[PDB]
């Protein structure tokens, strides 16, 4: 009975509208939920979906150097596999094993629908409409490290803009976009942006192309006997369309706009 650690992040895994009535594994739903079923189907095992203990994805702690979130749960033997939007980064591929990407993304732009800007280039030149990123994360560092013209030029601005274009939480940013009446563009991972654009208050939208390329993968403990099977499962699901099928499912069918 494989112990699956995952996490609450819409539309990857969510609590059923009447979850308090359903029990066990049926209490949940979302892209990753469906995906877990396919993995397990194609792999031939029984599983128990468990929401990650401390609610984090996974990072080494500032002092302890010890892994937290799902990564940690995987490194220290608490769970057997992680099925969630876990971006495949070096730091993690050094301690746990990733399947091939099951979905992809990149830093994109979120503008309040109807906004003049349409690309990063369109922003870089601009000075009228402000814009920023989360205060700390993939996105924030990508720019303070990016040696590309269009991006270096952008870092400088956000770098010391006042008020600060940065935001403490990920929803807080989206909030500024809307309430800023158009004087604010947010840069966030393409997946979140897409979701939000299909949500109520349909007043935002993703614009331009992704400024980079990443991808989410399924994680298993180093030495796991599920490793090889899982990776092959992700490949087959992609080869039969099931993934796109799903991404389209939770972002559009379930979309509200
Ligand atoms: N990929 C992450 C996990 N994950 C998955 C889906 C999602 O919507 N978010 C939310 C999120 C997206 C972009 C930013 C940003 O950079 O402004 C901040 C928060 C998330 O953090 C993992 O690899 O750690």
Swiss-Prot record:
Cellular localization per UniProt: Cell membrane; Postsynaptic cell membrane; Postsynaptic density membrane
Task: List S-S links within the chain.
Answer: 202-257
Q: What is its main location?
A: membrane
One GO BP: cellular response to amine stimulus
Annotated site residues (Crucial to convey clamshell closure to channel opening) in this chain:
117
Q: Which residues carry this modification: Phosphoserine?
A: 146, 180
The record's induction entry says: Down-regulated in the pyramidal cell layer of CA1 in the hippocampus by global ischemia.
Q: Which domain of life is it from?
A: Eukaryota
Post-translational events: Palmitoylated. Depalmitoylated upon L-glutamate stimulation. Ubiquitinated by RNF167, leading to its degradation.
Where are the residues marked Interaction with the cone snail toxin Con-ikot-ikot as a site? 60, 144, 236
Q: Name one GO molecular function term.
A: glutamate-gated receptor activity
Give a Gene Ontology cellular component term annotated to this protein: presynaptic active zone membrane
Binding-site positions, L-glutamate: 85, 87, 92, 138-139, 189
Q: In which tissues is it expressed?
A: Detected in forebrain. Detected in dendrites of neuronal cells. Expressed in the pyramidal cell layers of CA1 and CA3 and in the granule cell layer of the dentate gyrus.
Topology, Extracellular side: 116-257
Instruction: For this UniProt record, give its keywords in alphabetical order, as a comma-separated list.
Output: Cell membrane, Disulfide bond, Glycoprotein, Ion channel, Ion transport, Ligand-gated ion channel, Lipoprotein, Membrane, Palmitate, Phosphoprotein, Postsynaptic cell membrane, Receptor, Signal, Synapse, Transmembrane, Transmembrane helix, Transport, Ubl conjugation
- Other remarks on record? The postsynaptic actions of L-glutamate are mediated by a variety of receptors that are named according to their selective agonists. This receptor binds AMPA (quisqualate) > L-glutamate > kainate.
Domain comment?
A: The M4 transmembrane segment mediates tetramerization and is required for cell surface expression.
- What does the UniProt function comment say about this protein? Ionotropic glutamate receptor that functions as a ligand-gated cation channel, gated by L-glutamate and glutamatergic agonists such as alpha-amino-3-hydroxy-5-methyl-4-isoxazolepropionic acid (AMPA), quisqualic acid, and kainic acid. L-glutamate acts as an excitatory neurotransmitter at many synapses in the central nervous system and plays an important role in fast excitatory synaptic transmission.
State whether it acts alone or in a complex, and with which partners, per the record. Homotetramer or heterotetramer of pore-forming glutamate receptor subunits. Tetramers may be formed by the dimerization of dimers. May interact with MPP4. Forms a ternary complex with GRIP1 and CSPG4. Interacts with ATAD1 in an ATP-dependent manner. ATAD1-catalyzed ATP hydrolysis disrupts binding to ATAD1 and to GRIP1 and leads to AMPAR complex disassembly. Interacts with GRIP2. Interacts with GRIP1. Interacts with NSF via its C-terminus. Interacts with CACNG2, PICK1 and GRIP2. Interacts with GRIA1 and SYNDIG1. Part of a complex containing GRIA2, NSF and NAPA and/or NAPB.
* Assigned protein family: Belongs to the glutamate-gated ion channel (TC 1.A.10.1) family. GRIA2 subfamily.
What is the recorded name of this protein? Glutamate receptor 2
**Source organism of this protein record:** Rattus norvegicus (Rat)
Kindly list the organism's lineage: Eukaryota, Metazoa, Chordata, Craniata, Vertebrata
**Which gene name belongs to this protein?**
Gria2
């Amino acid at each position: 009975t494989v112990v699956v650690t995952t996490i609450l992040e819409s539309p990857y895994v969510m609590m059923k509208k009447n979850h308090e009535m359903l029990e066990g594994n049926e209490r949940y739903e979302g892209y990753c939920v469906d995906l877990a079923a396919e993995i397990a189907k194609h792999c031939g095992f029984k599983y128990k979906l468990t929401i990650v203990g401390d609610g984090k994805y996974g990072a080494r702690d500032a002092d302890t150097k010890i892994w937290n979130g799902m990564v940690g749960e995987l490194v220290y033997g608490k769970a057997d596999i992680a099925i969630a939007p876990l971006t495949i980064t070096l730091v993690r591929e050094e301690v746990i094993d990733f399947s091939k990407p099951f979905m992809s993304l990149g830093i994109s732009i979120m503008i309040k629908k109807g906004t003049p800007i349409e690309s990063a280039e369109d922003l870089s030149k601009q000075t009228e409409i402000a814009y920023g990123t989360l205060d700390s994360g993939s996105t924030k560092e990508f720019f303070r490290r990016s040696k590309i013209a269009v991006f270096d030029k952008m870092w400088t601005y956000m770098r010391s803009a006042e008020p600060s274009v940065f935001v403490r939480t990920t929803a807080e940013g989206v909030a500024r976009v809307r309430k800023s009446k158009g004087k604010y563009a947010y840069l966030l991972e393409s997946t979140m942006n897409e979701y939000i654009e299909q949500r109520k208050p349909c007043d935002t939208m993703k614009v331009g192309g992704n400024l980079d390329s990443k991808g989410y993968g399924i994680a298993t403990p180093k030495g796991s006997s599920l490793g090889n099977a899982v990776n092959l499962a992700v490949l087959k699901l992609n080869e039969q369309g099931l993934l796109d099928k799903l991404k389209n499912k939770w972002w559009y069918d379930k979309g509200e706009c």
